Structures are given as C-alpha cells and as structure tokens.
Design a binder for this molecule. Structure first.
Ligand code: CUZ
Ligand code: CUZ
Ligand code: CUA
Ligand code: CUA
Ligand SMILES: [Ca+2]
Ligand SMILES: [Ca+2]
Ligand SMILES: [Cl-]
Ligand SMILES: [Cl-]
Ligand SMILES: [Cl-]
Ligand SMILES: [K+]
Ligand SMILES: [K+]
Ligand code: NA
Ligand code: NA
Lengths: 586, 586
C-alpha cells in the first residue's frame, strides 16, 4: 500500500477532519495527510468572508453573532449503509449547533441552533434506509424552563435531551428527554434503533458526584416508537419551539416506550456501531473495558422478553486503561483507543463474545503504542457496510517531542496506521492544530465536486432575489442602486478588472457590494477587500457574493482583489469615495 | 558534478530540519511548518479571530490589537525574521496586513503575536522587509495605494499635489513608528542592503493612474532607493513635518521640479517591476520585471556615488538586465552565486548566474541561464533557505504557485495553492513535493532548527499578559493561588487557578446584565497540558497553556444556569472538567 503521494499523484481517499475548538472543517488527502481545503463553519474566515458576507450570515442566522465554535464529530450521509457523498454534518459544542456541509461545493450550506439544550457533543447519522435523521446529543443537564428561578440539576424539570434533526431540511424533527446526560451516539443498520452513552447518571455538577455510580448506561432509543407517537400527536413542546418533545425518562422504575437503559461502566464514552451491524460498542473509559450490546437482542429487550437490561450485553472485554473509542476493519476485528495506556488495541469481537460466556479465549491480538494519549480513531469506511480495512487514523491529544518545538502550545498528533495486514503498522505522524477530535474518510470515488457554481444555487439565492427587487440581472449588470442611506452596488468581475471601478456614497451610508464572478475558467477565484473597513470575501467562478458595511470614514478608500488571479492582479482595484457628513444634511 | 539528492521523508519520531514560517494570506494568520516534511506544526493567529485560543476574543489579544480589534480580517503576504549582522537571530517575526494597513510582530520564543500597529495616514501595507545590518533596527513597510492628505473628503484627485503614498519605517523593538518618507508613484515590494545605509522599493504606478491601462503606460517605472542615514540625519535635526494627528516624522522623498530629494533616488526599471530582492552576497538589489521579461540588477556599491552626484544617469547603477522569460515576479539566492526567479506566465523557476548576467550586460557572449524547471502553476514568490542572510545555504527552495488545477483531489470551486519544495542542493533543481495550502500564502521564510529557541512553558512575568497581572494586582489578587469573585457594581471579575481536571472556581452567581470577566491561570507545570475555557451559548472561548494567565469579558445577558467547560482535552476526566455560571433574572 503506497504511503507517499509524489508530485502529480493524487491521494486515494478524502479525509474530513473536525476543526475542534477552532471551529472549521478540514479536507485532507489520504494517505498523504496534507490539508487540501478548509471549510469554515463556526469560525469567521477572513479569506472567504464566511461570517462577514450576507450569504454566510443568513445561513448562520442569529448565531452569526458568535465568532467561535467547538466541533468534534463529522459524519457523511449514507444510503443503505454506504456513504452517498451528499452531505457532511458536524456538531458545535460551544454554541449548541449542528451544521451541514454540501460536499459538491464544499461549503456549509445549513446551520441550526438546537432549541432548549446546552452543548451539542455526540452526533451521528442514521444509516438505513438512508440518512433521514441526524442524531445529536445535548451533553449538559439544564433547568426547563431555564429562567433563573431554579438552578438544581436534581429538580424534576432539569434534564437534557436527545435530538433528531431532519437531514434534508435541517429543521428539528424531535427531541427525547432522557435521564442522566448524553456523551456520544451511533445508529444501527435497520433504522429502528439509535444509542448513546451517558456519564452523568448521577445528575451531579462536581467531579466526585459524576463518578459515584459504578455503572452509568447506554440509553437505547426505539425510533419507530418515537415516530409513531409524533404522528399520533402524543408529545409536548417546550418554550417557543414547536419541536415535538417525547419523555424518555423512567417514571418510578417503569420504562418509557421510547428508551431502554443498559447499565454500562463507567462514565462510558465512545459509542460505536460495528460495520456488520451486530453491536453497539461502548468504551468504558474509567472501566478498563468496552461493553458490547447485541443489536439483534434489542427488539426482545423492548418487548419485555429479557428479565434484565444487562441481558443485551454479550461482551465486556477487558482491554486496558482508558478505552475511549472503537473502530472496525470489516474483518471481524475492533480497534480501541486506550487513552491512559496510550495505545491502540486490536481485538476480535466474536472471540471477546466467547470469553464473556467463559470459554477462555485470548481476543486481544496486538497493542500498538501511539504518541500520545489517543482520543478517537477511525478506520476507512468503518461507519458503513463497506468497511475496507485499509487505513486507521488515531487522533492523539499530546504530541510532546514528536515534532519540532513551537512554544507552550503543541500540535495534536493524528497518526496514520496501516491495518491492511494482520499487524498494525504506524506509518505517519500528522501534526494538527486545535485538536481535531474525530475524522471521517471516504473513497475518492465517493465524493463528486463541482468546479463552477450553478447560478441558481440556494447558497446565494436570497441575494439573487434582492437583486431582482432592484431590477438587476447579476450576470451582466454593473450598477449602483441608491435607496435612502443604503447603497447597493452590483458588479460583474473578470480579471483583471472589477465591473464597477469607483462609486461615491455619503458618510454613514450602509453599503452592500454584490459581485458575480463571470469567469468560466476553473480555479480563477476573485476576492474583494475594502481597505481599513474590515471587509473581505471570496467570489469563485459563477458565484455571486455580497457584503454589507458602513462607510463611516470620509475620503477616498481603496478596494482590491485579494485572490491572485492574473499577472495584472496587483492592478485589479477600485475606489469608494465617501463625501463628508458636514457636506450632507444633519 | 554534485547532484541534488537530499532526503525528503521525515518518518515517525524523526524531526524536521528547518522551520518554515508561512504567511496566511487572505486568512490572516501565520503558519509554522516543518521542512522538508512540509507539515503544518502550529497556527499563530494575527489578524484573524481564532476560536481555539481566543485570539481576538481575550482581553490580552484585544489589548495588543488596539482599536483594530474591531476588524475580523487581515491579508498577509510577507513574513520576515529579525537579523543581527546579516544572520537570523530568532527573536521576532514581522508580517504585513494589506487589508487594514497594519504591521504585526510575533515573538518566536512563544510563537504568539505580541505587538501590532496600524500604520498612520496610509492605505494597504503590502511590501515588507527588515533591516539586516547591524541588526533589524527598522521594519520597512510599503503602503501601496496613493491617497489624499488630508483624506477628509474634500479632495479625491490622485493627481493632486497632496495625494501620495509613503514608505514606512517602524522601530522593530518598540513597534512604534520611526519615520515615513513621501514618494512619487506607488510602492510594491522592498528590501534592505547589508550595511544599514540603503533600502529600495519597486514602484509600479509611476504614472499615478487609477485605471489598469493608465498604470501600465510608462515604458519604465523605477526602484526608489532610500538613503536611510540621510533620513535619520534629518529626523535627528528636526527637519521634518507631521501629518494629521500622528507624531510620526514625515520626510519628503519626492522629486521637486526635477530636483532630487536628499532621501531618495529613482532608478528607472521596466516595467511595473514587482519583486525587490537583495542578493545574499550584498552586491545587488534585484528587481523582477513582471511586464518586462527581465530582471534589473542595481549595484549596491554604486549607490554612494549615485547619492553623491558622481553618476551622470541613475541608470548607471544598473549593472545587469538578464532576459529570463515571461512574467518575472520574484528572485531568491542559493549563496553559490546563482539567482532563482519565478516566471509567472511561462510557469517556471529559472536558475541563473548573477556575475555572468553582469558580464553579458557589458556585451560578453555568455549564457547565464542554467536551468528552467516547470512548476504547477503560475508561481509568485519563491524562497531559498536562509536566502535573506549572508548564510544562504543553497539547500531548499519553495515556489508558491497560485493555480493548483489538477495537482490535488478536487475540493469544489475553490482550489488550494500549490507550494512546491525543490531540492537545490546540487547542480540541478529537482521538484520533490507539492504542498497544498489554504488562502494563498504569498511568501514564506525558512530558518534552521538551531536558529529558533522556544519556551516550553510560560514565564509568569511574560509581557504578553502583564496588563492582566496589573488588573489582578489592583484587585489584590495573587493569580498563582487565588480563587475569588470580585463584585464591582454590575461588573464581576472571577479569578481562578486551574489544574486538571478541575477549574479552581467551579460555580459563580451573577445578575442578568452583569459584565463578567473570567481570568484563568494554568498552574500545571507539565509541558503540553493546555486547558481551555468555553461558556456555552455566549460566544466565549480561550486557551490557557501551562503557567499562562488568560482573561475574557462577556455580558451575562441570559438568565438561568449556563455551563462552562474546558475545551482542551487535558486529562482522562476532561469531559467532567466543567463549571456553572448562575444568572439571576430581573
Ligand atoms: Cu468530543 S469526544 Cu471522545 Cu468525540 Cu473528542
Ligand atoms: Cu503581496 S505580492 Cu508577489 Cu508578495 Cu504575494
Ligand atoms: Cu483579481 Cu487577483
Ligand atoms: Cu481541562 Cu480537558
Ligand atoms: Ca457517572
Ligand atoms: Ca507603471
Ligand atoms: Cl463515538
Ligand atoms: Cl520581493
Ligand atoms: Cl550550482
Ligand atoms: K493537545
Ligand atoms: K489560488
Ligand atoms: Na438554519
Ligand atoms: Na500597538
């Protein structure tokens, strides 16, 4: 298996890295591990103008006021248990959002603030029959309502909820109140069941209390029961949100019909569905084990045919210190990160199941040292029934001496490991910024991207509607529209000239500049920057972009094209002239 | 015969040989790479807002940024490392912001931006380079765009006698303005000699036009040479004016009715010249011809005669004008007597011998061109290791090309730049690595591993957060031990230590509308154990590395219980390293 990609060779897989608390998504080439693109999501990107342009702020909605995010879990939409390459979704733990990236244009095209929750952490996608729902965990217990009258996590109205977002429309589908809290989550290969780990069964706020119980649980959701109750109208709503809310809590030891709670030690973390669909596998973290939930025993569990919820556990292998996450090679082996032991341990799932029944068998196959303290890990296509067992990425949290010193703040170390053979082989150390937690890989042939924007793309359709209200045809017009103290400039662009090279406004006017790149040549992107006004954005071929700013400074103010586009790039400029307020009324 | 056969692979547990400091381009940051692996080791926020570390949100960063903290964007091009005696001394990195007219300084011991200045009375800081000898006393910065003085909206004519741009000198150590020199025309790139007396800058708009054709009209623009000693003499003697409300000494470097200033000479050079590069032997300022398929070589040792009036014609300091190819933009040096120039149109790097080009200029029939190497595609800057020092070592060359086209996996309409590593250690340039990068780094700079010395943990007296230490002192707080909430009207100042896995203050209560400052001191002494702080749904995020104090201010505008958490995976109990802010209503 080739590990080095030379000049003119292409990578075999795409990798989509979370940006961690930096807030973007990063597109890597695998196995070269080089970053091919950055996709801004919750960060403000000076380069493309994401967070500054009207198109991006419209997508972000009211949350456009935040300049930060904290993202952990990117996942690719699926059809029948295989990636279909349409969308990537990812969480924001810092401001409680889910974002959708359209994989044809590699941009964030939708974003939602999950109502009535704090901190979206775990996120995974329904597999079968396709990604109808995005499942998302709200991690922190809060009062409901959270109006500052009650603060006690022990109140009967303090809780967190499990969230289902409609993948296609990116609106809330439903929420399920749970006991405890929620950490990570995954879904089965039938569409009936999802599952989530919980570490705060104690509903405590301090360290000791959160560690009190020897077992917390994996909570299992019967999605068929939730849907049926939603169609029957058997639900409530919270606050101002119309989102159907179902109660998945136990009431006096009686299970709800939407959930079952399977006791699992201890403050368990990762929750990973095996690629053969047999198991939800929960990483024990404080317990040196993983717990294997047999998915084909879940119907019986939900029909009362099992005396004890532990009866769906068919394995609990002892692996090592600090198990956090598990992935799959498609050959019947599972790979689990041991954070404290700083290793990846490869183990055979059916043999672990044998050992649970007593048939003493050594299910552990290999322990590979990693550098150092691994969190998530990801084997190529591991979330699909096409898991190909070629590559494994272990994403470690301390790099220490593995890279040149760069000051007190160190990079992370995401290590590429060959798993095509029987022995795991460490091949490459990839330093990364801001702590990617998880990543997802896809074959090169599973992703199909556009090289030119479509002119009706919804990303900027609101801007086209604006232009229409002004009588503008964006493909041809270079016009300055005046409207009271608003000025709407529309121009085309074709290197090395802006279609409008100067315009005049009044001091204090609110200026919107809308630019359509009418070039057809791939890779010929233009930019637009207004000097000393904090204005910057990208316009790629056939895209329309716009940005609004206040002309608060009189005098002559240059704008220029930021994207090197032509030998005469330095000369693709224009001038905004701002007439002073003392020469205009008031 | 010596062949180019340097190793390019840096396997797990091996370390790179050189640091690379990349401009972040339109994205606004500085990036630290390892060479020859070309992996990004660290991101240093400068003009961007970084969600991960909180640069742009924290009080320490907004203090350094000053009033320009209101801007969320920057546009970088030219990173340069301070020198002593014509060799890198590893103290500081400087870089420009073309979008909002700033210069920033990065301290290479902590790899943080520690000072920032908005250059007064100019628009668009583009070209930037450092004094070399006797050390980097001055940062030289080009303001690209001609503007009226005053720019108060009375006069817009760029042909007005008070419309001009200025060459800028910043005190490298204080990061205060040293002086400004008014020039004719505009300014593109700049470099400095090896004595400290001279600096030079290309100018592409000798015609002071606003339109593309207008600024290409002159057969020749020029490189303007500055007699820095003479400027210093005038400043020391008080022979200067000031502009507007800036106390910066302003000297007039324009021609006056054909009469030369004492501070400048204009050397005619074809045509819209771009790069301005000092050869590592100190003999030449080399201007890349852009529209002219040439470079022009100015003999620095003829400049004293030029300013003394001994030379008949300013063209007499031109000692070579080799013809290289279409679209010369920039030049670098191997320390062996060869120059290497990017050919933007021909899409090549051309290697040529400077002394042979000088002899050809006299009429000798000698081919100074050694090799043309195809690059992919349209190169702008290029950089050979240690090229800006008298230690130029002739080992590595990076060419930073603006169109990557098919050299990487497609990632949608926006493509990465292609920064290509080229082995120049031998007689033949050899292309060895294609490096995709985001947002158009324009230029980069390499330093030997042993030229950079970094801190492993913060010093408690570090100037970076000295203002915060001063605030704490006013509140009577010992930041190394104290965990306290100070109430001051509707202001609340929380001070806490932190030690994984617990915040030193795990809950506090405020009134709705209070302005909350949270100051956190990481008292861990273990390298790499960084902590974070995020307030859920409040747009609040920051890094606290070992022995650092960081602080951030936000208004508690939402009643209820609001969780905060450590964003930096730091401990097996990371998930449980949390606290609660309780906000009382009404
Ligand atoms: Cu957010 S947690 Cu193991 Cu996923 Cu990193
Ligand atoms: Cu700003 S220009 Cu050839 Cu330096 Cu990139
Ligand atoms: Cu348009 Cu560069
Ligand atoms: Cu503190 Cu993770
Ligand atoms: Ca627990
Ligand atoms: Ca010109
Ligand atoms: Cl997981
Ligand atoms: Cl240059
Ligand atoms: Cl040579
Ligand atoms: K880390
Ligand atoms: K580009
Ligand atoms: Na939305
Ligand atoms: Na300053």
């Amino acid at each position: 298996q080739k590990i080095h990609v030379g000049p003119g060779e292409l990578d075999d897989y795409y990798g989509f890295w979370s940006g961690g608390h930096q807030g973007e998504v990063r597109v890597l080439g695998v196995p070269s591990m080089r970053e091919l693109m950055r996709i801004p999501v919750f960060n403000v990107d000076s380069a493309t103008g994401w967070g500054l342009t009207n198109e991006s702020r419209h997508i972000m909605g009211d949350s456009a006021k935040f300049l930060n995010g904290d993202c952990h879990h990117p996942h690719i939409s699926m059809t029948d248990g295989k990636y279909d390459g349409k969308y990537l979704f990812i969480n924001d733990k810092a401001n409680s959002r889910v974002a959708r990236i359209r994989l044809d244009i590699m941009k964030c095209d939708k974003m939602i603030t999950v109502p009535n929750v704090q901190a979206i952490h775990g996120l995974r996608l329904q597999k079968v029959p396709h990604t109808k729902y995005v499942f998302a965990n709200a991690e922190f217990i809060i009062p409901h309502p959270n109006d500052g009258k009650v603060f006690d996590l022990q109140d009967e109205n303090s809780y967190t909820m499990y969230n289902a977002i409609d993948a296609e429309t990116m609106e809330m589908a439903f929420q399920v109140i749970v006991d405890g809290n929620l950490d990570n989550t995954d879904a089965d290969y039938t569409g009936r069941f999802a599952a989530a780990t919980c570490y705060n069964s104690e509903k405590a706020f301090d360290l000791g209390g959160m560690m009190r119980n020897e077992r917390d649980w994996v909570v299992v959701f019967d999605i068929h029961a939730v849907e049926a109750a939603v169609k029957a109208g058997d639900f409530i709503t919270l606050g101002d949100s119309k989102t159907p809310v179902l109660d998945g809590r136990k009431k006096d030891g009686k299970d709800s019909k939407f959930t079952r709670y399977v006791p699992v030690p201890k403050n368990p973390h990762g929750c990973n569905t095996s690629s053969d669909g047999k198991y939800f596998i929960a990483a024990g973290k404080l317990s040196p084990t993983c717990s294997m939930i047999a998915i084909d025993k879940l119907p019986d569990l939900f029909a009362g045919k099992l005396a004890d919820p532990r009866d769906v556990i068919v394995g609990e292998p002892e692996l090592g210190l600090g198990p956090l996450h598990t992935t799959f090679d498609g050959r019947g082996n599972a790979y689990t990160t041991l954070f404290i032991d700083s290793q990846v341990v490869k183990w055979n799932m059916e043999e672990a199941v044998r050992a649970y029944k007593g048939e003493k068998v050594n299910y552990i196959k290999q322990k590979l040292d990693v550098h150092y303290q691994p969190g998530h890990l990801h084997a190529s296509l591991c979330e699909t029934n096409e898991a190909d067992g070629k590559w494994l990425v272990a994403l470690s949290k301390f790099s220490k001496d593995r890279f040149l010193p760069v000051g007190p703040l160190h990079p992370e170390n995401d290590q590429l490991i060959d798993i095509s053979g029987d022995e795991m082989k460490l091949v490459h150390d990839g330093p990364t910024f801001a702590e990617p937690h998880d990543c997802i890989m896809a074959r090169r042939d599973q992703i199909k991207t556009k090289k030119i924007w479509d002119r009706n793309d919804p990303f900027f359709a609101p801007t086209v509607e604006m232009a229409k209200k002004d009588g503008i045809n964006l493909d041809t017009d270079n016009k300055v529209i005046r409207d009271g103290n608003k000025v709407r400039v529309y121009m085309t662009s074709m290197a090395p000239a802006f279609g409008v090279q100067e315009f005049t406004v009044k001091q204090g006017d609110e200026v919107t500049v809308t630019i359509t790149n009418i070039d057809q040549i791939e890779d010929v992107s233009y930019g637009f920057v207004v000097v000393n006004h904090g204005v910057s954005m990208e316009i790629s071929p056939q895209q329309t972009s716009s940005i609004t700013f206040v002309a608060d400074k009189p005098g002559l103010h240059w704008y220029y094209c930021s994207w090197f586009c032509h030998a005469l790039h330095m000369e693709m400029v224009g001038r905004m002239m701002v007439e002073p307020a003392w020469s205009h009324p008031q």
